[PDB]
Ligand SMILES: *[C@@H]1O[C@H](CO)[C@@H](O[C@@H]2O[C@H](CO)[C@@H](O[C@@H]3O[C@H](CO[C@H]4O[C@H](CO)[C@@H](O)[C@H](O)[C@@H]4O)[C@@H](O)[C@H](O[C@H]4O[C@H](CO)[C@@H](O)[C@H](O)[C@@H]4O)[C@@H]3O)[C@H](O)[C@H]2NC(C)=O)[C@H](O)[C@H]1NC(C)=O
Ligand SMILES: *[C@@H]1O[C@H](CO)[C@@H](O[C@@H]2O[C@H](CO)[C@@H](O[C@@H]3O[C@H](CO[C@H]4O[C@H](CO)[C@@H](O)[C@H](O)[C@@H]4O)[C@@H](O)[C@H](O[C@H]4O[C@H](CO)[C@@H](O)[C@H](O)[C@@H]4O)[C@@H]3O)[C@H](O)[C@H]2NC(C)=O)[C@H](O)[C@H]1NC(C)=O
């Protein structure tokens with residue numbers, strides 16, 4: 001979408017994966033979807049280094065809506081959002097952050113809350129802009145393919161007309177199988193800043209691999225359509241939650257980064273461990289994710305030893321390499337050379353290990369190197385020519 | 388097997404899952420299959436509370452064999468085991484531990500090392516006894532159904548004839564699909580102390596789940612056949628390795644415990660975290676696993692919320708309950724009562740949460756309770772009557 005927004009992938013926090021549709025504020029006041037939850041997360045983002053590292057979006061997901069008023073104007077749940085959305089937006093802006101909200105192009109949201117039907121698109125866009133929202137996630141439950149085909153372009157146009165810059169996250173392609181001929185990616189890129197192509201992430205390694213596999217199988221289609229202002233969205237980071245081991249957490253971060261994915265966390269920032277914070281706030285990792293070229297990476301090699309190699313081109317003739325072990329046994333000593341990974345001759349390279357900080361220097365194409373990769377884990381290099 | 392051994396499930400350490408067939412001691416001297424590795428693990432088991440908690444077996448797996456001498460007698464790899472197996476057993480015995488060894492009923496071991504063919508069964512049994520081995524794991528690679536049907540009883544008879552008590556771990560049923568009519572559990576119970584029924588565990592949550600689900604699907608057959616002296620073996624514990632998150636690690640321990648499974652670790656005891664050590668060395672968990680009745684537990688309840696309940700009867704009218712979440716979203720508040728979990732009578736119970744240590748008092752059959760279960764995680768209760 002040509003609205004000047006998201007020239008690099010959006011970094012932030014999204015409520016959904018961790019907090020879902022928990023509206024029982026009587027039994028569970030600390031973890032229910034509410035004004036309090038978002039304010040407390042905003043506080044952590046501002047105080048604990050998150051905003052400073054680039055995580056700027058605080059996004060509300062499903063289950064915020066209370067109904068529509070006599071004019072058809074959207075309202076939050078009065079008990080869970082007693083001060084309303086402008087209050088929350090103003091609060092988030094006062095901390096140097098941006099606020100995202102959620103709507104559904106259809107009769108209802110996926111959890112059955114009031115939907116943004118075709119005749120409500122313009123009104124709801126105007127409402128969001130008036131509230132000073134900075135991002136909209138438009139889901140596609142309870143609609144037909146033709147309704148979505150009208151509705152997503154209509155919303156992009158309605159948002160534009162408000163005059164407020166609002167980042168547009170579309171779920172349109174996920175509902176149509178994510179692939180040609182039903183999905184037109186040139187069209188999507190003209191109307192959306194980012195799009196959910198595929199299944200909802202769940203808090204499991206199986207879910208991560210399932211998404212990873214789908215994006216890799218279809219990378220010839222998906223890789224070229226990504227760039228500044230228009231990203232593929234493999235869904236939220238699971239880092240800080242229940243399903244991923246340490247190696248797996250490091251793996252998702254590295255793989256989302258080489259895929260030029262949004263770094264949208266969804267975790268309790270109030271209780272996040274130092275170890276998981278270290279992953280998400282890794283400065284070189286973020287630098288790579290936020291590379292100005294915005295070129296999505298690809299899997300470039302697959303071995304029968306079950307080691308996969310991913311490569312992302314970066315600015316200043318630099319590259320990111322992810323050595324990824326799909327093995328389930330033990331650490332694997334992977335022997336290779338840059339020449340075997342299709343690098344150009346005569347150039348001498350240097351690598352910084354993104355997680356350890358270690359520097360490997362004097363790498364010519366023919367230089368043999370060994371990387372030790374843990375099972376379900378990665379080794380990630382930031383690679384650059386040296387003069 | 389009526390040899391006076393394993394009246395409770397065996398507890399110890401097995402090399403395979405974590406260290407596999409790593410024989411390259413030139414490049415990896417600290418992690419290769421060698422006498423040093425086993426001596427170092429023995430020291431850890433003696434010094435770090437493992438032995439005193441009940442972890443007594445230290446088991447060599449595949450890839451230890453050098454060959455056969457002129458008389459056809461097995462010898463360990465001379466470079467990797469320079470002092471010989473008797474030296475290692477001596478060392479193990481001096482620390483109050485027991486030594487386990489590996490052989491294969493067939494042409495070769497699964498990794499292609501010399502096999503214990505039918506004409507070598509007796510000689511190998513005598514060799515292990517002379518070496519003062521305490522446990523034998525007999526694999527079934529590179530053999531026919533008829534060879535196994537002859538060989539496993541032949542080895543049991545041979546081991547018996549040596550006069551040395553040697554715990555017998557049989558993989559026979561795993562090569563036969565693990566089920567009747569192809570597997571005869573009445574025979575296995577008479578000739579083996581424990582048997583691998585099913586697939587090799589790998590370092591992943593998916594692997595734990597597939598094993599757990601196979602054992603649950605066939606529990607009507609498998610539950611009754613286990614007891615003092617003869618156990619089902621769902622394979623090694625993964626706790627301390629790479630593939631399991633904290634919740635999943637706590638889950639495998641709890642679930643292996645209610646299944647009256649062996650507690651055979653396979654992890655680097657030199658670098659194991661305190662958090663993982665606290666799981667494996669949990670005194671009440673071990674007490675439950677080592678319960679003198681040796682009655683294997685069952686899944687007693689399954690709900691659409693994807694919460695599963697397991698129950699294991701224990702000595703002194705006590706029970707172990709495992710509330711297991713197969714959800715992949717967020718913590719779940721499970722509402723139940725003992726009466727809904729098929730507890731009868733007017734008995735008043737008290738429960739101790741095995742992980743938190745918390746005590747819940749005044750539980751009658753009708754009393755409503757709530758437990759909070761994390762995704763891919765468990766809540767475990769030790770439940771007992773009070774008067
Ligand atoms: C509502 O929708 C409209 C129409 O889509 C949006 O207006 C566009 O906004 C974008 C982003 O700000 C504009 O793109 C920028 O144009 C700059 C100059 O273009 C001029 O010249 C062309 C002809 O050559 C004219 O069409 C145009 O009117 C301008 O006069 C560029 O300099 C910018 O360059 C950026 O990208 C390059 C290359 O990637 C980088 O090197 C630079 O660093 C820089 O970031 C950029 O391309 C676009 O021109 C606007 N279109 C129109 C018709 O005005 C609104 O933004 C949108 N409003 C809201 C509220 O969402
Ligand atoms: C080769 O194979 C034979 C079996 O064919 C094995 O012999 C068995 O060995 C076990 C273990 O040593 C014996 O079990 C023990 O029996 C002891 C006495 O029981 C006798 O008396 C009763 C009278 O009612 C008879 O019914 C019974 O047949 C025996 O003759 C007990 O003292 C032992 O009790 C143990 O368990 C209790 C738990 O309640 C504890 O309190 C005790 O401390 C103790 O640990 C035990 O039950 C068994 O009797 C033998 N069977 C036969 C048929 O002889 C060989 O061991 C095996 N050889 C090798 C080396 O593997």
Ligand SMILES: *[C@@H]1O[C@H](CO[C@@H]2O[C@@H](C)[C@@H](O)[C@@H](O)[C@@H]2O)[C@@H](O[C@@H]2O[C@H](CO)[C@@H](O[C@@H]3O[C@H](CO)[C@@H](O)[C@H](O)[C@@H]3O)[C@H](O)[C@H]2NC(C)=O)[C@H](O)[C@H]1NC(C)=O
Nearest residue numbers: 105106107108115117118140141142143144145146147148
């Ligand atoms: C989006 O919503 C529209 C609007 O209708 C509204 O929502 C419905 C689910 C009902 O709750 C309505 O009371 C409400 O006005 C849906 O269009 C409507 O669908 C309903 C139910 O399918 C239709 O009523 C049915 O008519 C058939 C006869 O063909 C009977 O067999 C049924 O018993 C029932 O009475 C109704 O005609 C229709 N109304 C309009 C104005 O079109 C629409 O289905 C829904 N779209 C999607 C994609 O979910």
Ligand SMILES: *[C@@H]1O[C@H](CO[C@@H]2O[C@@H](C)[C@@H](O)[C@@H](O)[C@@H]2O)[C@@H](O[C@@H]2O[C@H](CO)[C@@H](O)[C@H](O)[C@H]2NC(C)=O)[C@H](O)[C@H]1NC(C)=O
Nearest residue numbers: 492493494495502504505527528529530531532533534535
């Ligand atoms: C286990 O091995 C036996 C022994 O034969 C060995 O393997 C042969 C291929 C050859 O290399 C011999 O020198 C070895 O001693 C296998 O039994 C033989 O099977 C082969 C078929 O390849 C056949 O030619 C012979 O007649 C068989 N020998 C006898 C006398 O039994 C057996 O097949 C192997 N079992 C499994 C399941 O792998």
Ligand SMILES: *[C@@H]1O[C@H](CO)[C@@H](O)[C@H](O)[C@H]1NC(C)=O
Nearest residue numbers: 335336337365366367368369
């Ligand atoms: C790299 O190592 C391989 C061993 O696999 C060796 O054959 C080759 O000569 C080495 N290449 C160079 C240029 O050192």
Ligand SMILES: *[C@@H]1O[C@H](CO)[C@@H](O)[C@H](O)[C@H]1NC(C)=O
Nearest residue numbers: 722723724752753754755756
């Ligand atoms: C248990 O809870 C149910 C509602 O879930 C309630 O109807 C019932 O009265 C409770 N039972 C007791 C004994 O309090």
Ligand SMILES: OC[C@H]1O[C@H](O)[C@H](O)[C@@H](O)[C@H]1O
Nearest residue numbers: 016061062110111139171200
């Ligand atoms: O109910 C909200 C839920 O709806 C869909 O499933 C989306 O794909 C999820 O990301 C989430 O927004």
Ligand SMILES: OC[C@H]1O[C@H](O)[C@H](O)[C@@H](O)[C@H]1O
Nearest residue numbers: 110141171174175198199200
């Ligand atoms: O209907 C719920 C919906 O949620 C997401 O958008 C998924 O991508 C879809 O495949 C579907 O499961």
Ligand SMILES: OC[C@H]1O[C@H](O)[C@H](O)[C@@H](O)[C@H]1O
Nearest residue numbers: 403448449496497498526587
């Ligand atoms: O090769 C060693 C390997 O062989 C078989 O697959 C067994 O089931 C494993 O437990 C292990 O002993």
Ligand SMILES: OC[C@H]1O[C@H](O)[C@H](O)[C@@H](O)[C@H]1O
Nearest residue numbers: 497528558561562585586587
């Ligand atoms: O040789 C590996 C071995 O591992 C397990 O025991 C399987 O159940 C067997 O069928 C066999 O594949």
